[PDB]
Amino acid sequence: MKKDIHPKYEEITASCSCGNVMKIRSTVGHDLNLDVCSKCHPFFTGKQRDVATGGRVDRFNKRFNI
């Protein structure tokens, strides 16, 4: 690359709540503490709940039953 024209780009420490710590090369200048990683984001176990349809007939039959 051309030497001067780019900003700096070096390795940082991204620690997350999921136990995952990633030493990845980035552009923040300091350490980093992630909200969600790729290891804890609720897609691998979320979408089966995340629409939350249920059942109206069972809502009826729950709230009273004859």
Partner 1 sequence: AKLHDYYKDEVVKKLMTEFNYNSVMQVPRVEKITLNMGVGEAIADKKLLDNAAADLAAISGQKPLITKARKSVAGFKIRQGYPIGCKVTLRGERMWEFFERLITIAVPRIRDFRGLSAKSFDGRGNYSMGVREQIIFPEIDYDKVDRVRGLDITITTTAKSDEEGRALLAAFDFPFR
Residue 8 or 56: the one with the smaller Cβ distance to partner 1 is: 8
**Positions 34 through 53 that interact with RNA (CB under 7 A):** none
Dist CA 5 CA 43 (whole Å): 39
Judged by CB under 7 A, the residue of 2, 25, 47, 49 near RNA is 2
Which strand (E) or helix (H) includes residue 53? none
Question: Is there a binding annotation on residue 37?
Answer: no
Local structure of residue 45 (DSSP, 8 states): T
Residues linked to residue 22 through DSSP beta bridges, in sequence order: 14
Q: Would you tell me which residues interact with partner 1 (CB under 8 A)? A: 1, 5-9, 14, 22, 24-28, 32, 34-38, 41, 43, 47, 50
